[model samples]
Target chain A: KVHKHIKANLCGKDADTTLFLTEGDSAIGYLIDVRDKELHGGYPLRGKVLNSWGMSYADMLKNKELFDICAITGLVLGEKAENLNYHNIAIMTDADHDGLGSIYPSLLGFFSNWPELFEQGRIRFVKTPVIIAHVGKKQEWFYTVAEYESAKDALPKHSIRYIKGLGSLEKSEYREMIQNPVYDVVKLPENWKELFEMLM
Target chain B: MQLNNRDLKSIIDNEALAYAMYTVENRAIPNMIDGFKPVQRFVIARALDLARGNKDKFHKLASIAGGVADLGYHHGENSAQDAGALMANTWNNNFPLLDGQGNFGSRTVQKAAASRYIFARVSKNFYNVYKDTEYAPVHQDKEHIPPAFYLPIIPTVLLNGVSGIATGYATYILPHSVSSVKKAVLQALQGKKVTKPKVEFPEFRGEVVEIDGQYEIRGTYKFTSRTQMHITEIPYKYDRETYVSKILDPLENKGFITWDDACGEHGFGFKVKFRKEYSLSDNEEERHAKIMKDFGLIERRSQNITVINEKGKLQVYDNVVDLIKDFVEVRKTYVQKRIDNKIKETESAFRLAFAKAHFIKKVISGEIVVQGKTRKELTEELSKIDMYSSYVDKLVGMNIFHMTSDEAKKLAEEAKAKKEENEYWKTTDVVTEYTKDLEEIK
Candidate 1:
């Protein structure tokens, strides 16, 4: 069981559950509208989280958003991963710089506290669509700006819609994304600690 | 509307003068009192405001930059973020003004990580500077006004040397040792003339020699063998990449050295082998002199100490002693002001406590009754009973009838304590305060 305050935002069985950590209630609402009720759970983050890279374990727990995340995901700091409530945890944000900004701190939180999650290949990033081109009867989706930029000239005469955020997508688009989800499994690089220290 | 040559020249001259003055006063030169440019001042003010007396916790650099931009900085967020990061860079200053948690770049030409990834808090020294001083509003607007300036106990302009260029003016003051600056200020405060202190760059293992009023910085090198020389430390602000590209690569190309290798991990470290044919000296001293001359190991820097005075006038000083003297004068004035303000506060506190204690005692002794008495009547009664005139209204506003005997006793004790505090503040010496600040930095 999770904390009472966040229990409404979280729901799923303990086995084979994939938790989607969203940017806000709007993203969570969109996920709730299309996600499978039995296999998916949603947790809404308030805003940019505290940088947990240099924070102590006690200091990290003092952040309400990070604490609520641990409560919902059943992650214990400084403890090995065993009998967790969720099998997979995914960060679902928009496809923009702000989305990357939101993702780094959340990744830092997990990287600072729970390394076992990454080692077990349980952490993932949901790759959302950024551009959707519609032709006469077919619709093409581009998940990244680089992809859209590379193939945009060869695309046929079509009306293109750019998704600025998850809130801007239509219900059908959300449904399509939910039905055929694309995710990047996060892995620890050989110099993962050094990379994070240098860049972050 | 067209204008004649005289009219156009007048307009241009006025506008140019205004812009140049604004740049020099607010952007390029630091204030003499606090020793901070406007942007750096805003960054520190926003950080201190966010910390709110809690120096233990750290805030994200992005939030601090955002706060600075929203508060008063009319520039890009990147500028504010860079200022905040630079203040936390220990390599850049003898003592960093902000406590940084993450990598705040290196001594080389590397930039700090993105603002979102780093965290910072006010350092202990920074907190001590402005903790007790009253802040004046920077802007005339009533809603969101940051402080105009922060008061520092030490001469921060000399502590961390500043260099900037405005329209027709520029400043280049070298960094000085904190202990030396503190001693200079203390001596100046005692009416003694002090000389200029030596330039001390933190964490740089080199020598800065003054020859004919110019600074010549030299790096240290040791001979591994007679043929190979290992450079240990380079002059400050000389990056490895630039040295390699401009000096080492050219030297290697010109065949001054046969080969070069980068060896050190943190700072400048390189090993170069000189050709036996070019370096045919048998004596080690002559060969070392030739190598030093060829490698351009010694660099010269000129000093130009310019700052905006308290009257907002640009003034140029001849030596660091002049800057220290100015700082001592302004600091003494503010220290006296702080003591006066504290004395006034303690006096007010004493009056309030005395009034509360008197009201509580009279009510409990049945000489005065708070029940069935309107607030105006209570105020008149307290006034007629010869209560402290300044605190009569406040005492009547308080719930004197409900205050217990223990509470009245506590108020009496508080009044006694405030009286003693007021006495101490009245007799507080400015030199004592300076000595105390010196002790804190030490």
Candidate 2:
């Protein structure tokens, strides 16, 4: 069998299987509606659950979320698990320094201590725009204050939605930003160990 | 005495006339002899004075600009630097007179390194033009500040034309390829008209566009981007940021240029692209072109041929052919003067040989006994000899035996003449070959 929550859904194509690591239930709720059941999957954590830096090597996958995360990816935690289940692993978070910057090191540590997963460019940090401005018929997302300001003069009576977290977006808006044909997030470097050490 | 308005008006007319003359002759316009404005001439001459050759290490821009200023290019340091950069910038100049060794910007958008960081030296083309300077007449800037040794015979003005507005005159010479300019100069040398008036070629930033038949720059509708629309090719002196803000930003929907950044190392590389839906286009790039057009980015601009002739009179020409004609006339005088200098050198070499031959002939006749005198002393003594005279005088003085020094002197004159003729023919060949080489470019 596969993930216990979405065991009925089969992976449509190897490259199409995207596992979104959501921050909380509200974040997961948005993805559950917009995600293509056959190709996309979600695994939400109550909060930071993978703080593996304090754990010994013997105690690696000892928590509920950690155990399910491994089962969701169909891999055992140690380095011996040769094949990866998901082709794309993305950590979706708000476009703020505190949003994923707090969770990434712990998440990265769990993956680093367990199966050496984060290092091969299969996983990337995805940015959700902090500000969404509505102008006339089209809605545009702004990641910075300057991006908003540069266009605001021409914008007509626009409404600004400040996204503090992934939960702030409507499921459709969240899915629109994520799976829109033109929308694809940029990948961080594959050298994960150095990136972790640099972050820590 | 109380000054009346008419008295003040008289003083104003004199003052205005002087200022206009100063601007036209010395500030705004370039010299017809060597198409350089006062500062450009100073910068090249100063850089050449500082460095030895094209291959010589480039001097810092600040150093060159400082030297130009100290040499009395007192308009402003920025003026000297801006002129130096314009001269050295490959995009701005067709034949960049100065070889720049650092970020001097591109044709698509104007940019540069600080003058302290950038380095410059005289280009070989500039040196060629300078190598001939001593052989011709040049307009004097200060009585102390001289023009280039020789201005390019090709009317490099037409090559990297100028644009400036003065009190009563304006110049707008569009640039041509190094090849087309060479062709035009050769045609002009023959007192003929130009064959190709339009300079059509890829823009300096590797954009595929012809300058157009009307001497306008036009073509190429490609911009690079998948989610972003990045414009990598812009026109000469077109400011990328300003063009985006004024033309692109206003015309397109807000947030069109969401992330405008220079993508990679160089040229027109503003990285942000159009959002996907807007990226699809149906072709009249004037959505692109009209914006640039409205912002005064002319693809093909007229090369305004206005210059202060050597006589100090500001003259305007209809086309580059006329400029080329004047350039050739100046070059002919240069060639003649250069030949005269070489001919003078040859006469001195021949006279010395004749002096040596006279000593050798006397030794053969047993009329003179000699111990080794220093060569210089012997040559000096021989110079005082009565038998050897001018080549012509010696010809009249030669005896039937022909042991006289006249024969050696006669041979020397013939040898010198042959060399002079070779030089003359070589220059003539050079003119032909320069245009012929440009034919390949065509």
Candidate 3:
């Protein structure tokens, strides 16, 4: 049941901005105050830093490369972002391989490049839901692949593509895939051992 | 038939005789040149053309490509002859070895093994031999094979043998189509050079119990695919499942010797020759127990597992039988033929479309035109048609909305103008730009 979203085109480009999970005293907190004026900026990227950094392959080897690449790419995208204050730079990517690949690099790029942003309480990465469901007239509830597939027969005749992330969809889809029934941005925990191995 | 890289690595990574696939491929010998990815053969073969065991082209891949060296740096373009000479020159520099002591066996015979016969006997039969597997030195020339970790010859080397080669080109083992191992070797025995050799297997996969002074390869090879029969998924499968309580000859083979599965997906295993230091000890009565504990080669079910007609039974290991069957069946087994046919149809359609487009292009290029005198007369008679009311009414009754409508009407109207007039030429966004030049002339 935790819906994960891995979206590309962060900051409207191939790359993404950085997000760091930090306390108020950290460098991220300091930078957030400065960058907050530029846009709706910065939320604390609260996740397992050590695990997201270093990971092992045999556990889920194929996802390793994709996850790392996405993280680094996301950071590149994040640097060019604007127009939001207290805006959550949620790590919304494909709930699948792409998300897994950049999981570490994205975290590291965020923490290291925008450390002060997080420390200043300006930048943050949120984990958004991956699935959206339509139950009533224009009424929709989003779930992950498993949740959607479990009600496979109930799905509409209109075929839904495997939308890896909200970034690929139109702008309004962000809330649909992200906040969903619950409005808060939530992220899943990282596999520490695998994340640490990858980070190193 | 040439494999890319994956197939070769599978065989090398999985093969038993593969002590350490040359840290780097020795490409100095002329015998090593096959022109495929296993350029190791060509690199080595060309070296042998001048002298065996060439080392200059060892590990430095770029050296074989080009650049300067101390003695002589000669690179003669893309000519195969130039490449041959380069390899020959490189071989003369740092020679490796020729395993062949006598006859035509010039493959990696180490310096000490010269003139020494490999008192080797074929223990087991595998469907396919990884022809690319070889022992190269720790150091070699630029043409030397890259580290195994770097260049994966797994699938390519093992699956697809170098399909194309000039004369004097020799290459390595292709995956044996388990359907026909004996037939393959027999075909080669009748002059087949074992390109798809069902060669010797050094080890069996199942338990080797020392009970009653007899050890069978436990299960028969019946229930498995042809490929699984020979190459065992050892550390991966059987080694993970079966083992006795303790180590029988725990310190015998020690670190250097390791065990693998026999009767893999195919019907054979590598014939591994454990060092003489490894002797079956009296305490090793429970070899099956040790295999289960150490290597993990346990039977799936202890009770339901009868040696005959069992779920995990190994087939009877007959070399000629497996080979001959594979050879005969491969020719007839048209499973992949449908794919080939689909490919052929697609290619044919593509070619036909290309030809049609080419012919249309030729016609448009002013290459051909049908002659019509009446049409030519009409072309000159622009204003000859009389505009009468009744005739116009009749034309109007025909539902001809305008003076021109369909292709025929348009062509007729076009006849009213110069030969170059068309709808696009009359009203296109680009037309104004083109006409602008004429306006400028005014």
Candidate 4:
């Protein structure tokens, strides 16, 4: 059974469903305001998920939060992904180091515990902008620090607004981003497990 | 409107003070009753919850930390894992609360294995100390709140010492032996002068003595010859690596002493040979004293008993007896409360059994018919008798087999047993019961 702390908006299997794993309730609230209720669903994570790099299946199930996530996402331990509920699962977090930290454990947990889902190319990352610039009559969104650093000198004089997180986005900005979202499909590298060991 | 610089400074000061107070009260200091900080309490509570029916079974350390994080420990999982590991470490804690399996680190500055490898379960000692936690008052402000503080059967704050540094407050408490603390508590309960317990560590084989109001910890060594000695123990808080790097290595490099490590028949063993030419003293006694001094075999420790009292106020104690007295007073109150609660519970059980026996008697005597009546009708009939309407609902749903003569005899026997239990609870003295509890733990 799913835990009481989880707030999910699930859709039937008939639709091409996409689940957005958000940072917290505020991020879920913002996504709910602009998401397509029939297609886009969300599950707000409380904090950093468990690091399942060296954990066993039974041990992972002992964590209630992780178990609830599995139930919400229709993940069966030690089974293939033939009966998954969603077609795509995307992690949506803030554009900061803490957000990146949260993403690493979530990825590790999914990849280590349920590798079939990653092998089937069902996981992705939703890109969020860190700096929004109003360049004269035009606007530009920079998703990375390097992106803003290289373009600030070439662009015309304008005001740059740094976004704290998804919670700080205005309603119109949220609408604009959700209307045309960019998805980064993370492919499994040749040394994926070694990379996880190095970074984690 | 423009803000003034002075106003901004005042706001910053107030905010900083608030943060400092929060750190001191919630994060750093241990409570006087339970001797745990917020994170430690959350970890232990989760451990207890997991070890309820499966006491001998062990769970992964990562799983326990995850459970604590889910219980609203907002400090992340690393701190929770570290706290759990520290509680399980036998050398660190005088009476470890958790029974650890796997590499839980060593006193020689070895880091513990990752959380995924180690496993732990609540120890028998922990269960005995915190068995009465169900009667503790839980905090109501959060979703997954545990008790505010557990009333241990023994004085845990003295059994396992604590050392922490908060914003402006710091504490260093020395651990005492279980028998010594039990003796002190008994004396305090008897209205006599509570004797101070000598400091002791569970894994340390050294000697701790009071020299001019400060604790002097000395290691034991025996001289094999006039130039050679073997050290069997090192002072507390000085691990082998640090002792070697800071003292022995320097002495060896200076050609004053040569040392070699060994695994003897017993505990820690280190062979040392001192050069008499380097020693300025020619007398044998003075040279022995110089060798002891140069080896850094003694360490001094000062006690600063700072803790959050029962009223949620930070206070300091000058000695251990005052803390023991305070613990005794609190334990007495809780013990009496527990006894009263037990008596009340048994009395209620007896009344319910008596009611059931009467209702069964009526059924058996054909005064109340249950063979052809609905639940409502039976409930109404039972309520019409001299039974509480609250008990009527329970009586109506009872199994039909309970209406037999044999069932009536059993209920009568149960009521008698409950009555006897209530009599025992009512007559038990609080001080004697507490002393008995201490003996069981010992």
Candidate 5:
């Protein structure tokens, strides 16, 4: 079976690695330019991948996107840990309310079906900044709405605007957010059976 | 005395039947509904009767046993005491309903301190079982013979498991985890199929293996024996010395392998070393298994699931589902009864409030004059009004007759709100099924 689309920009680095996937080419293109080719990989989606909740392993193999997920992750459907390619699978999506509250459900909907990966801690959601206050030589990036609420009053002279999409961040700022002080991700707890319901 | 052979046989048969019934009904099995044997229920009920708080000291073990026997647990003080101690043993009980101050026993053997020495009281776990406020409440001031009510909401029998021998029946139920049972119960109550979840045997401190869709206990462990065969795998509730003494029996005359040097742990623990061993057979695993088997370490038998049904007759259950179903059924009955009581309480409360509010409203508007009337006369006049409920007549004469117009109007509004609250309660139907404490369920 055909595996996945390889990024030509990714130089051979066997060190720490992560892949970014989400809808909208603007964000994908921005991430591609800024990501360290040796350490990171970026892949874009065509919006609303298939829900695997009720789909059978054979059925999942039929869909191109589902098949690509399996091929990229080296996961053999109907079994677990058959040939896992990556130590970690980071799901990078838009940091807006829709991304956190709405679109993340569809992203998690696919993973919910593959519970083995979720339970094994192989899956994570990459937290991108939604609100970034740009004050002429300084910037404040708020990853959460709660943080934005409190951080808004931190500075009087700064102008606050929603990042809207990851594409809005320039290469240097995007790289700073992506690479430095690395590994900011969300992991679901053991009682995710009910917690999964909230996201879905 | 000359008796016919047929008549003699009938007499013997009749006595046997009576003995069987006594053992099954009153002695060996617990009532399936409450999940407690007569003696066990009495011990717990008496402890509840004593009702010792943290501030007050624990009841003496001997005293508890004596009290239970006095209350008709006539199976000897020793048996009653052992049952109490077993229940109090923290390791023996996953849901320990009792707090034992002194050493009740080691996990491997029943070598407890004298009943006179140790002291015990009801643990908070008892409250989990006896949850109803009407009966078996947290605070008890009055002493009862059998605590009047001994209904346990949770099925402690299945949760802790039970083993007993009677004339023609016995039960050796294995305890299951609380999380598994409660999850299945929640599902079962919702009209869904209930299935067993992953479990670990209390004796074995390891996860189970699922082969062919059935859970199996893995008994394999590391061992080194040469001169002596040391066993550290003694399950909780068996003594180290007692087990070692049994092993000595075969060595004396059974013509088995002999040990040169042996040191068994003082208690039932992880230290049992046997050194300098020589076996004729090349298969060491086979030898070890045989030794353990002969020593009565792993003689597997089908679980004996017997209980005294609510009908006051002994009955055998085939599976865990039956017990779960009965537990749900019992709770449903309890909820139904609670709702029935709620309905009565709500109705009476509403009526009393309405009548008092009306009476006070009349008094406020000067429709009923109270200035010239004596207390008795006003009470008699209020009592004469049959339209108002009997409950209100008592309150009207004593508390509300002397209220100001503004105060009476405020009281009327308060009563109206209370009436609305009960009206809302009457609509809820009393909760049928509830999720019990996850930890305490086991």
Candidate 6:
């Protein structure tokens, strides 16, 4: 709910910064203006479900929100589990928040009973660039100074890189980074063949 | 259940404990005995016990009645007879001739236009008049009437319909007796359906009836198990005229509201704040003298200095200010909403709507209860009227009198002459006889 105080406060107590006090620059509205078109990115799930196993919504029968979430998830997973078609799903979030507390448990509950799905490239993590700016129409990244310095000071190559808040990237960069961006495949190494055999 | 004298006394003794919300078997019985059982016989009996002659007995009665104030609920302490005099010899300090000239008007502005003393007897305003204002105080607490004092169920208020209360799952019901149910219920249930306080006796049909405009339940009958009887109580009202006189004599007996030299053009003072903010000088003596001179403040002055008449005008020195300065401290609220040229607006509105000396609101004072009838009538004339009288039982309980305005005013003139030269005005003791008229039922 937007309170009376927030209506008047566009930005408070901090000035002349790209993102004032971590909140002013947040993607609170669920859209990231990357390149040309706006994009929506979020897992359509309530927080703290899969990590607690089935114990989180122990009384979901009485809780309206939990009941709604449980019904939707139950119908989707019930038929899919019976069909035995395993699929890989990406769990992506900001790198700052230890890990996504919101997304991990959701995938965990789905993957818990199916180790084959987990082993057969069924789950993965996604990493998206935070910044994409321009030096007179030339896109750049300065979000991470060390990454920028490393790229700029590399042997026989120097490039300007600036990291920014999300949606600062050009469309091509976003497509390269997130869309079909290097899907990680899980496989038993040659040294772990015996271990893999025993697990199977 | 038939009760005796001792049984009735025991009922009065345990009334407080029961009314505090206790489960009593015969709750209404004790309440009935306490309420209808008048105190006039007791007062007269005690009056006879202390007298040697007419004057001495009258004197002793004064002393006895003085201690009557001490007699309170068993909740308080013993109700001792007054040892001194209840009738006080107060001086009237009003100048009516000055009022005619419009020069000697009251200066104490504490009184609102409709401020009045509502007493137990409306026909005969219950209290001794204070100076010029006929201030009456109502005896009954209308919003919260104790069940012990409430009259019986059928004729008192139930079926006739009155106020409602939810006790446990049962409501001790509103006044709606069986007979008057047609008119009363039609009035209560029609249109807006506002709750009017009344009760009904469902069991015994013939024990009660309406005396004036209200119903009275006087039969011995058992109420519904749900009805919690206020045994030591008398559900009464002091806000109506008929209800006032139903119980007692009129106020003219003691003669308040007389406006003559005989009654001596009685006067009252009102203290006014000239502007929204009024401040006196920093120097105490100098400041007080100026306020007294400017506003003619009637202060309780110092002991040493004597008041002097200066060429028909009163004059006071700085020394005299101490004695008169401390009698009362008054600050009247005023909104600084009037322009200097439009000052008549505030003054006229105050005089018209809120003045104590010359306002009809003062005449009615509290007899009027806003039942939203006028508002509804303003909206629609088809709305029927429901009148809920509150002060009847109070006048019945107290032995005072309340007369109508025509009766009071027709004789507010004769009362003036009878009041003057009649030294009785100074020492008139408004005696109320608490008659114990209903002991035979038990």
What C-alpha lDDT do the candidate models reach, one value each? 0.70, 0.59, 0.30, 0.74, 0.59, 0.26
In the range B103-164, model 3's lDDT, one tens digit per residue, is 22111111222112221111111112222223222222332333221111111222222232
Model 4 / residue B158 / CA error / Å: 1.5
lDDT by residue (B1-442, candidate 5, tens digit) is 8864554556787788987655543576666666676677678777867874552456777787777766655467777888888777655666677876654544443455445646778887777665653543221323224532355665667767678776667788767776676677677766787786445445456335555434434333344544434444543334434554666444544455433222221322232333234343447777667655654554333556787665655677777788788877777666667667777888777777777777776776788786788754766676667755375445655364347766677777878887887877677653432543333544
Taking the tens digit of each residue's C-alpha lDDT, what string does model 2 give over B34-128?
A: 76777877787678678864457667788887777566564677888878887786656667678775556554335453456457787766655
Superior by lDDT: candidate 3 or candidate 6: 3
TM-score of chain B of 4: 0.91
Summing lDDT over every window of 10 consecutive residues in candidate 3 chain B, give the lowest-scoring window: B302-311
- Of 5 and 6, the candidate ahead on TM-score is 5
- Candidate 2: residue B306 Cα off by (Å): 2.3
Each candidate's interface RMSD (Å, one decimal) is 21.3, 21.8, 22.3, 21.0, 32.6, 37.3
Candidate 6 structure lDDT? 0.26
Give me candidate 1's interface root-mean-square deviation: 21.3
Error of 3 at B120 (Å): 46
What local lDDT score does residue A153 receive in model 5, on the 0 to 100 scale?
71
Candidates' chain A TM-scores: 0.87, 0.77, 0.37, 0.86, 0.78, 0.43
Clash-forming residue pairs, model 4: none
Those runs of model 4 whose alpha carbons end farther than 4 Å from true positions after fitting are: A1-200, B1-14, B17-22, B280-284, B374-376, B400-407
Question: Order the candidates by lDDT, highest first — what do you get?
Answer: 4, 1, 5, 2, 3, 6
Please tell me which predicted candidate would have the highest lDDT against the true structure. 4
How big is the positional error of residue A185 in model 6, measured in Å on the Cα after superposition?
A: 6.0
TM-score on alpha carbons, each prediction: 0.64, 0.54, 0.23, 0.67, 0.54, 0.20
Q: Give the per-prediction TM-score of chain B.
A: 0.87, 0.71, 0.20, 0.91, 0.74, 0.16
CA shift at B29, candidate 2, in angstroms?
A: 1.6
Across residues A39-106, which tens digit of lDDT does each residue of candidate 6 receive? 11222222334332434334434544334433422323323332221122445443333234444444
